[PDB]
């Protein structure tokens, strides 16, 4: 066999990599050891970044069709059991009107709930459709790197045959026990039971959290509303009884599905790249599910890498473009492993406000409910203490908008404009802050195209660089054309303004851009700003060719 | 003829007064000179306070059934003409996601567009159903007041007969040229210009991919009556005939959608407010006491709130439960609102000339001058850039009269004998008090909205209150409020419902939002008037706290 | 006081008459004894004919905004109690897919549930807006007729004054005990029993996974007012107090949903129809001429159609465009409908005893007897099977009064001087004329509905017609109808709009459904009255065809 990129693994990271590469016209072979996509719902929270990426590749509408929308995700309930009485509720997944505003303003996309069970075949199929070779029941065994490429040994679980594939690059998207990361010698620094069942819980959810949390803490998570379910906590037909005491009524017929377990050794790779091997997804960040960062960061790893491999494979970028994958994504790996872990400590204070031990008996828990309804000033302090504790759990339940969106890249693939880092006005984990400084994601605002709403993001992406400016920045069109033909790279210029293809109909682009109208923003295929000019002066214009060459390593 | 309250006028203020008075079991006769409710769409923006009032009396659902919802009000377009090129668009009626958040947080209710044409009969019919006598084609001619009541002379435009009505009180809800205000001798201030309104019908392809309450042409307005067949053009005694059809054509920018030229009507305004709204047994409300520009859509809404302020007070006085001095609080609380909206509606006018100024245009531009301004606007120079920025800045500043004024709509601050001060100073406003609502539980402020639950289903704090009575809100540790309330209730012969909000209770602070908004400990209490204003606040359930309730209620009632 | 038409009554018939008369530019005074529109929900089923009439006068959209739609009316449940076990369910209000097809094909409009409580003010307000004078708290006492008009004596319940009105005509729309019918000396026939109605409020979990207009308990009815908070219980001068709350409880089958016992009202019916509806200058309509059971919901609907039949006729006569003999056609066309619905509503009653009979029950079963019938119903024997089949057969037969009667609702067949016979025999009905609508374009039948297009957007044949005037429909090869129509129109001084339906025309037979329904060649013509009835039909555009139009119109107008 032979291919440009061997992608080991067909999870979210591998499948997205395959899809992106196949789109840019790069030959890839994506393999998977197992028969199918993941049989479990597993990760389910899709954040705005992943939806933006789906939007870019044309899959957002299908995703939205299958996904449960944001407004059926917000009603988070803390209770003894679902049919029982509830401690109280928190506005999960940005369902508070203020959080919702902040959500809406940050992206054209929105949170939704789309279990991996469904996300995966949607991306695996799109990858093969766009031109990726996809091969399941095929196991990566090892590889040898020379400085011309790589030779991997594969075991075929259908024919029993063992064969070699010659590639230029590997992508290790092979999950939390990546043999690819092990063979690349990547340095790393820094459990639960799931039960799928089926029961009509419509009556006791009609009147719309994405999750029910029962205090040992047991999560009742919506798979499909509201007939397919999953219980998760920190087994035989007893699992039925486990689903009965968590529902707090054995009155609904329950259909006990598959029972699995999930163990996690929380670590991140300090480096994600070794020679021609690039690792991504769970392979470089293993962590708790708090905040639902896993799948989303993994897909974003793929989006960062694919266009860079394509430019290098095409000879348009020097191979040093690829150094920026480690530079930009490794800090995200460490960040999310640390954040997901930190969120765990938001939970003991809930038990403590109850005046409970880590493991409460049934008499101890019923006693805490009593103390909670106590008409004394001490009862009041108790109710306030409980509320304060529950509120603090939001950081892992949709509160973490800043973590999700505030990527700040520093690398050779980002050309500094000379401004200092403005930092963040408010807490950078809770709150997204838009920035057009190179290294930040292009901000979303609405423009119009034929008086119909279009995002700044929809002007960009599609595997190419895009330059955004205004009418007084007309010279950018010519300058980008000279740079484009000399460097042999596509540079799409959009001049936003009255009477143009795209129009700053609400004035929001002028508002968000941070530069004069004649300034320009150069946006990477992955939606990150890589160059910013403040005006269309001679010196401003001349710097474009310098920045693009620099980004390309030429 | 004999009644307790003669209501002169069946517009929004009169009709709401009749409905509330009837719901409170007060006999009223509401009259109207004309044969019907108002033929024209007229006022159409229904703000959250009016919707709350509709919510309280059970008309909010029917109101929403008929009204156009907030999400179809947001695209205001500034353009040369409808089918022409836009200057740009503003996120009117709190349609910006941030403005929307602030909107949603403030009230269980929402902006909608409901023309008077439909609002009026909905309230007039409810008033008659609830027990009010309603008599149209009946004209108030005058009255004489004595110590015990008032005798008005009426002219019946059906029988030609002239007859008298004996009433204890007269409501002057008779509009911008109130004869009742004139006869009561109300002083008016702030006297410091008309508009023509053309209805037409046309299926307007071009007002869909936006969805907006209005289109402004540079100044003509193309406002929505029904989306999007019905239509009305407005601009600043004038005749006009069939060229009005032409006048519709060049404001639509094309003449190939058939249009049906409906009724043509003028509206003149002599901007003024009454500095006092009450004289003896005469109370004036609505346009009768505040005459102003339509900017901000404050008219109808403030008028309905005038009625909501007065009705429960008249009912208590007529029932002998409150002394007649309770009615003094109507002028104290509503007159400042009257002056406020007249001044605000006027001020919003001066936000439009800078738009012409940014375009380097005269107040009255020809079609060459305007076509030139459009060219200059697409100029690829730094001076073109400055112009585009200047235009945007000007257009943005118009938002204050087009949904920006949330603060104006909601930040009522009452000081009177019907509000018992709790001893705290006025915290004032953190942000601009015209643009931004600030919730407050200090006496004199409207009860803040948050969501509670009742059987795990969401209910507003507002839904715990109102219904023509006083309500006291507290938490579990404030249990003593129930008994204290009962003693005060039986002794003063006044209804006072206590809600203990908490776990295992009828109403539950499920989101913790009540503890967060209340500004007091759980054992504290808020006393809410029938009109949803807080009239008393205790910080805890101490003896001194508890004993003050009776004092406050007696004080509010004037007893 | 002086008017053209004095309308006695402001119920559905009177209000619709006032609205139509005002739309036709006829001066009317509509009076009502009481202070408001009807406080009770009362009639609530709005059939397609009433919706068509609302469509014609532009109120269908607001009607639909308020009404519950057909898809939420279909699950009728027969049960012991609400929270108890069902006997079974019928596909009420044409909810069976076949019945739904037949429903949809018949009309552009659809069944909805709109309580009188809301229908009435919507029409009363429209009548006043369109130009009618409306005067409530005003009581008709009597009248004397002479050659030139009528003088009625009125009592004003506001002023106490008694006064006279001079009118050319009096409409008796004054309900089931019409004093106007009594004074006109109308004969009544078919004299060959009351019901109590209890309003209450409760959130009823159990009426959701079905979605039905009513619940029948074995006989009590639990009918929907609003889905599903509002409620009303109905069963066959009686007092009742708080046990009515208990009476609600055992009909709900549980006592753990809070309920709020509203107003309690009785309804007695003396079943009769007027054999004639007109005497001199007096015309009676609505309950005044047909008093009957609610089975089938025919009352309000037939009453509104009475008004629709009469109004355009009065307008032509008052304008001098038609001779007064045109009004003779009101009795000829509407009296048979009156007798028909009284007999049908009554007949539907006898469909309920077989239900008790299939259950081997007495007319009045105890709770042991009923519990035994439920046991027998689950018996695993062939005799149990026969019982289950017998129950189903009985329940199915009740559909005729619960939406089965499409034929009754729509198959009006007019014979009078206001319908010009075309010489064809009566084709009669292929299927049962009570159950099934049969479309017909023969003179005397309602214009059939099919979809055409106008700018490729769907429009009903009905939407081409109505609006207070005559309309002529034809196709391209019938072009000569336009000129012929114009000559007849100018000579008789009557408006007559011609629509040429075809390719490239204003209205297009896009689906070929007009050619399919018309029963005539393309060059043929249908003349449609303002009330949507076909009054003339020509088979082609021959000379003899064309010349007959003038003859028909003169004949219809009595000239
Ligand atoms: C069992 C389980 C349950 C989870 N539940 C949750 C949850 O509830 N909430 C949450 O937020 N996250 C959850 N996660 C984490 C989540 O699934 C993501 O972190 C994400 O799936 C990681 O994507 P990858 O695309 O990086 O990993 P993977 O989805 O694990 O994909 C790795 C792929 O490589 C394949 N592979 C591995 N080794 C080889 C080999 N030698 N040769 C060929 N193919 C190979 C695997 O078959 C697989 O297809 C769960 C993960 C697991 C494993
Ligand atoms: C033509 C027109 C267009 C308008 N357009 C807008 C708009 O676009 N936006 C906006 O915000 N506001 C608009 N308004 C103003 C708006 O309708 C409100 O200010 C509001 O209706 C005032 O309520 P009232 O209830 O205070 O006044 P009114 O609605 O005017 O009611 C007064 C009532 O008293 C009756 N009456 C008066 N004198 C007597 C008497 N002597 N005897 C018996 N009855 C009497 C009147 O007939 C009427 O029923 C418009 C007003 C008019 C007239
Ligand atoms: C309590 C009740 C319950 C009903 N429930 C149902 C039901 O469930 N289903 C159903 O199909 N039908 C029901 N009906 C009957 C139904 O309301 C219709 O038959 C219809 O309203 C009759 O229309 P009208 O317009 O013909 O009669 P009405 O609606 O009765 O109108 C008559 C009008 O004339 C007025 N009037 C009478 N006498 C005088 C006078 N001397 N002077 C001035 N005004 C006068 C009356 O006040 C009223 O305004 C019910 C009727 C009643 C009374
Ligand atoms: O599934 C999740 C999504 C976001 C945040 C936390 C979780 C989760 C955390 C622990 C067990 C089950 C689910
Ligand atoms: O109808 C309006 C609502 C809010 C603000 C302004 C207007 C308006 C103001 C002047 C002319 C037409 C409409
Ligand atoms: O309200 C109805 C509508 C259609 C058919 C019958 C009824 C009815 C008949 C008797 C008592 C209650 C309701």
Short mmCIF file of C-alpha atoms in Angstrom, two decimals, chain A residues 31-315:
data_model
loop_
_atom_site.label_atom_id
_atom_site.label_comp_id
_atom_site.label_asym_id
_atom_site.label_seq_id
_atom_site.Cartn_x
_atom_site.Cartn_y
_atom_site.Cartn_z
CA UNK A 31 -7.84 2.86 9.85
CA UNK A 32 -9.76 1.50 12.79
CA UNK A 33 -9.11 -1.64 14.77
CA UNK A 34 -12.79 -2.35 15.42
CA UNK A 35 -15.81 -3.31 13.31
CA UNK A 36 -17.84 -0.14 13.71
CA UNK A 37 -18.00 3.37 14.98
CA UNK A 38 -18.37 3.69 18.75
CA UNK A 39 -21.34 1.70 20.04
CA UNK A 40 -21.73 4.01 23.02
CA UNK A 41 -23.11 7.56 23.05
CA UNK A 42 -19.97 8.57 25.01
CA UNK A 43 -19.22 12.28 24.58
CA UNK A 44 -22.35 14.23 23.63
CA UNK A 45 -21.84 17.96 24.17
CA UNK A 46 -20.95 19.66 20.91
CA UNK A 47 -19.58 23.14 21.47
CA UNK A 48 -19.57 26.13 19.14
CA UNK A 49 -16.09 25.49 17.77
CA UNK A 50 -16.93 21.97 16.62
CA UNK A 51 -20.19 23.26 15.12
CA UNK A 52 -18.25 26.00 13.33
CA UNK A 53 -15.99 23.33 11.87
CA UNK A 54 -19.03 21.30 10.84
CA UNK A 55 -20.45 24.51 9.34
CA UNK A 56 -17.24 25.04 7.37
CA UNK A 57 -17.31 21.54 5.86
CA UNK A 58 -21.04 21.61 5.22
CA UNK A 59 -22.18 19.22 7.93
CA UNK A 60 -23.75 21.60 10.47
CA UNK A 61 -27.31 21.30 9.11
CA UNK A 62 -27.23 17.51 9.26
CA UNK A 63 -25.68 17.66 12.69
CA UNK A 64 -28.43 20.02 13.88
CA UNK A 65 -31.05 17.68 12.41
CA UNK A 66 -29.80 14.81 14.59
CA UNK A 67 -28.77 16.80 17.65
CA UNK A 68 -30.96 17.92 20.56
CA UNK A 69 -30.95 21.75 20.53
CA UNK A 70 -29.60 24.01 23.30
CA UNK A 71 -32.87 24.86 24.73
CA UNK A 72 -33.60 21.32 25.75
CA UNK A 73 -30.23 21.10 27.52
CA UNK A 74 -30.51 23.86 30.10
CA UNK A 75 -32.67 22.51 32.92
CA UNK A 76 -30.06 20.89 35.19
CA UNK A 77 -31.56 19.15 38.21
CA UNK A 78 -29.91 18.12 41.47
CA UNK A 79 -32.14 15.69 43.36
CA UNK A 80 -32.38 12.49 45.39
CA UNK A 81 -33.99 10.73 42.42
CA UNK A 82 -35.98 11.95 39.44
CA UNK A 83 -39.40 11.21 40.91
CA UNK A 84 -38.26 12.59 44.23
CA UNK A 85 -37.76 16.07 45.57
CA UNK A 86 -34.99 18.28 44.23
CA UNK A 87 -32.24 20.21 45.97
CA UNK A 88 -32.43 22.74 43.18
CA UNK A 89 -31.46 23.53 39.61
CA UNK A 90 -28.70 25.37 37.73
CA UNK A 91 -28.81 26.92 34.25
CA UNK A 92 -26.58 24.45 32.42
CA UNK A 93 -25.19 24.89 28.90
CA UNK A 94 -25.49 28.66 28.87
CA UNK A 95 -29.25 28.59 29.44
CA UNK A 96 -29.27 31.69 31.68
CA UNK A 97 -30.41 34.60 29.47
CA UNK A 98 -27.12 36.42 30.14
CA UNK A 99 -25.03 33.35 29.38
CA UNK A 100 -27.20 32.77 26.32
CA UNK A 101 -26.47 36.27 25.02
CA UNK A 102 -22.77 35.73 25.53
CA UNK A 103 -23.13 32.38 23.71
CA UNK A 104 -25.02 33.83 20.76
CA UNK A 105 -22.64 36.77 20.34
CA UNK A 106 -19.56 34.54 20.25
CA UNK A 107 -20.45 32.35 17.26
CA UNK A 108 -22.99 31.76 14.52
CA UNK A 109 -23.19 28.25 16.00
CA UNK A 110 -24.74 26.90 19.18
CA UNK A 111 -24.37 24.11 21.73
CA UNK A 112 -26.29 20.99 20.93
CA UNK A 113 -26.38 17.47 22.20
CA UNK A 114 -25.18 14.95 19.63
CA UNK A 115 -23.87 11.66 21.05
CA UNK A 116 -20.77 10.19 19.44
CA UNK A 117 -22.91 7.19 18.51
CA UNK A 118 -24.27 9.49 15.79
CA UNK A 119 -21.45 12.05 15.28
CA UNK A 120 -18.94 9.39 14.26
CA UNK A 121 -20.64 7.73 11.29
CA UNK A 122 -21.62 11.18 10.04
CA UNK A 123 -17.93 12.15 9.83
CA UNK A 124 -16.58 8.73 8.79
CA UNK A 125 -18.97 8.64 5.84
CA UNK A 126 -18.15 12.20 4.81
CA UNK A 127 -14.43 11.37 4.88
CA UNK A 128 -14.86 8.47 2.45
CA UNK A 129 -17.23 10.52 0.27
CA UNK A 130 -14.69 13.34 -0.03
CA UNK A 131 -11.96 10.92 -1.06
CA UNK A 132 -10.34 9.39 2.01
CA UNK A 133 -9.65 5.66 2.02
CA UNK A 134 -11.26 4.22 5.13
CA UNK A 135 -10.50 0.78 6.49
CA UNK A 136 -11.96 -0.74 9.64
CA UNK A 137 -11.06 -4.09 11.29
CA UNK A 138 -7.47 -3.07 10.66
CA UNK A 139 -4.97 -2.69 13.47
CA UNK A 140 -1.86 -0.56 13.57
CA UNK A 141 1.00 -2.65 14.94
CA UNK A 142 4.02 -0.37 14.56
CA UNK A 143 6.06 1.75 12.18
CA UNK A 144 9.58 2.75 11.17
CA UNK A 145 10.48 6.32 10.23
CA UNK A 146 13.09 7.32 7.72
CA UNK A 147 13.43 10.96 6.68
CA UNK A 148 11.63 10.36 3.39
CA UNK A 149 8.55 8.96 5.14
CA UNK A 150 7.11 6.19 7.30
CA UNK A 151 6.41 2.49 6.94
CA UNK A 152 3.66 1.07 9.15
CA UNK A 153 2.78 -2.57 9.81
CA UNK A 154 -0.97 -3.33 9.74
CA UNK A 155 -2.91 -6.41 10.83
CA UNK A 156 -6.16 -7.08 8.96
CA UNK A 157 -8.78 -8.59 11.24
CA UNK A 158 -10.85 -9.87 8.31
CA UNK A 159 -8.29 -11.62 6.10
CA UNK A 160 -5.83 -12.25 8.92
CA UNK A 161 -3.22 -10.76 6.59
CA UNK A 162 -0.42 -8.49 7.77
CA UNK A 163 0.68 -5.76 5.37
CA UNK A 164 2.71 -2.55 5.19
CA UNK A 165 1.64 0.95 4.31
CA UNK A 166 4.12 3.55 3.13
CA UNK A 167 3.15 7.10 4.08
CA UNK A 168 4.70 10.55 4.29
CA UNK A 169 3.03 11.32 7.63
CA UNK A 170 1.26 9.40 10.39
CA UNK A 171 -1.54 10.93 12.42
CA UNK A 172 -1.89 9.20 15.79
CA UNK A 173 -5.61 9.63 16.49
CA UNK A 174 -5.66 6.30 18.27
CA UNK A 175 -7.19 7.21 21.57
CA UNK A 176 -6.37 7.20 25.24
CA UNK A 177 -3.84 4.34 25.01
CA UNK A 178 -2.20 5.50 21.81
CA UNK A 179 0.44 3.03 20.65
CA UNK A 180 1.37 5.71 18.10
CA UNK A 181 2.19 8.18 20.90
CA UNK A 182 4.17 5.42 22.64
CA UNK A 183 6.13 4.60 19.50
CA UNK A 184 6.77 8.32 18.89
CA UNK A 185 8.07 8.53 22.46
CA UNK A 186 5.88 11.51 23.42
CA UNK A 187 6.39 12.72 27.01
CA UNK A 188 3.26 12.96 29.19
CA UNK A 189 2.84 15.01 32.38
CA UNK A 190 0.11 15.89 34.86
CA UNK A 191 -13.14 5.72 36.30
CA UNK A 192 -16.92 5.30 35.91
CA UNK A 193 -19.70 2.83 35.10
CA UNK A 194 -22.24 3.58 32.35
CA UNK A 195 -25.56 1.80 31.86
CA UNK A 196 -27.76 2.31 28.82
CA UNK A 197 -31.48 1.68 29.34
CA UNK A 198 -34.77 2.62 27.66
CA UNK A 199 -37.74 4.07 29.52
CA UNK A 200 -40.46 6.68 28.96
CA UNK A 201 -39.38 9.46 31.33
CA UNK A 202 -41.29 12.09 29.38
CA UNK A 203 -43.73 12.73 32.24
CA UNK A 204 -40.87 13.60 34.59
CA UNK A 205 -38.79 15.75 32.24
CA UNK A 206 -41.40 17.30 29.94
CA UNK A 207 -42.09 20.09 32.34
CA UNK A 208 -35.54 19.84 30.01
CA UNK A 209 -32.10 19.67 31.62
CA UNK A 210 -29.74 17.57 29.53
CA UNK A 211 -28.93 15.84 32.78
CA UNK A 212 -30.31 14.77 36.13
CA UNK A 213 -27.77 14.48 38.93
CA UNK A 214 -28.59 12.37 41.95
CA UNK A 215 -26.81 12.61 45.29
CA UNK A 216 -22.46 8.55 45.75
CA UNK A 217 -23.41 10.85 42.84
CA UNK A 218 -25.26 9.24 39.92
CA UNK A 219 -25.92 11.05 36.62
CA UNK A 220 -29.06 10.43 34.57
CA UNK A 221 -28.19 11.69 31.10
CA UNK A 222 -30.52 12.14 28.15
CA UNK A 223 -29.63 10.08 25.07
CA UNK A 224 -32.76 10.87 23.12
CA UNK A 225 -35.52 12.90 24.76
CA UNK A 226 -36.81 11.27 26.60
CA UNK A 227 -36.96 7.57 25.86
CA UNK A 228 -33.31 6.55 25.66
CA UNK A 229 -31.17 6.92 28.73
CA UNK A 230 -27.87 6.41 30.43
CA UNK A 231 -26.89 6.29 34.07
CA UNK A 232 -23.30 7.13 35.03
CA UNK A 233 -21.58 7.02 38.42
CA UNK A 234 -18.15 7.03 40.06
CA UNK A 235 -23.39 -5.89 37.06
CA UNK A 236 -26.43 -8.08 36.31
CA UNK A 237 -30.23 -7.60 36.39
CA UNK A 238 -29.42 -5.68 39.57
CA UNK A 239 -28.70 -2.77 37.22
CA UNK A 240 -32.47 -2.71 36.75
CA UNK A 241 -32.83 -2.10 40.48
CA UNK A 242 -30.06 0.51 40.13
CA UNK A 243 -32.15 2.25 37.51
CA UNK A 244 -35.25 1.93 39.74
CA UNK A 245 -33.81 3.64 42.84
CA UNK A 246 -32.28 6.38 40.69
CA UNK A 247 -35.64 7.00 39.03
CA UNK A 248 -37.29 6.76 42.46
CA UNK A 249 -40.17 4.69 41.09
CA UNK A 250 -40.30 1.17 39.65
CA UNK A 251 -43.46 2.11 37.78
CA UNK A 252 -41.96 2.79 34.37
CA UNK A 253 -40.97 -0.23 32.31
CA UNK A 254 -37.19 -0.14 31.91
CA UNK A 255 -35.15 -1.86 29.18
CA UNK A 256 -31.59 -2.50 30.43
CA UNK A 257 -29.13 -1.95 27.59
CA UNK A 258 -25.35 -2.41 27.45
CA UNK A 259 -23.16 -1.77 30.48
CA UNK A 260 -19.67 -0.43 30.01
CA UNK A 261 -16.92 1.15 32.06
CA UNK A 262 -14.57 4.01 31.34
CA UNK A 263 -11.25 4.45 33.11
CA UNK A 264 -9.09 7.53 32.70
CA UNK A 265 -5.47 8.18 33.50
CA UNK A 266 -5.48 11.96 33.44
CA UNK A 267 -2.45 13.14 31.47
CA UNK A 268 -1.49 15.41 28.61
CA UNK A 269 1.36 15.10 26.13
CA UNK A 270 3.81 17.97 26.63
CA UNK A 271 4.73 17.57 22.96
CA UNK A 272 2.30 16.20 20.32
CA UNK A 273 4.69 15.67 17.41
CA UNK A 274 7.79 13.54 16.81
CA UNK A 275 9.38 13.64 13.35
CA UNK A 276 6.67 12.63 10.85
CA UNK A 277 4.27 11.52 13.57
CA UNK A 278 1.53 13.82 14.84
CA UNK A 279 -0.80 12.81 17.62
CA UNK A 280 -4.14 14.34 18.45
CA UNK A 281 -7.36 13.82 20.40
CA UNK A 282 -7.38 11.46 23.40
CA UNK A 283 -3.89 10.38 22.28
CA UNK A 284 -2.48 13.67 23.67
CA UNK A 285 -5.13 14.66 26.26
CA UNK A 286 -6.77 12.20 28.63
CA UNK A 287 -9.19 13.71 31.15
CA UNK A 288 -12.51 13.79 33.03
CA UNK A 289 -15.74 14.48 31.12
CA UNK A 290 -16.41 17.69 33.07
CA UNK A 291 -17.02 20.53 30.63
CA UNK A 292 -17.38 18.16 27.68
CA UNK A 293 -14.08 19.36 26.25
CA UNK A 294 -12.80 16.03 24.93
CA UNK A 295 -14.45 15.46 21.59
CA UNK A 296 -14.50 19.16 20.85
CA UNK A 297 -10.78 19.73 21.48
CA UNK A 298 -9.96 16.56 19.55
CA UNK A 299 -11.87 17.77 16.49
CA UNK A 300 -10.14 21.12 16.80
CA UNK A 301 -6.72 19.36 16.90
CA UNK A 302 -7.58 17.87 13.50
CA UNK A 303 -8.74 21.24 12.09
CA UNK A 304 -5.46 22.84 13.17
CA UNK A 305 -3.28 20.19 11.47
CA UNK A 306 -4.98 19.21 8.20
CA UNK A 307 -4.52 22.41 6.18
CA UNK A 308 -0.90 22.60 7.27
CA UNK A 309 -0.13 19.05 6.15
CA UNK A 310 -1.88 19.83 2.84
CA UNK A 311 0.24 22.93 2.12
CA UNK A 312 3.43 21.01 2.96
CA UNK A 313 2.46 17.95 0.94
CA UNK A 314 1.70 20.30 -1.95
CA UNK A 315 5.13 21.94 -1.58
#
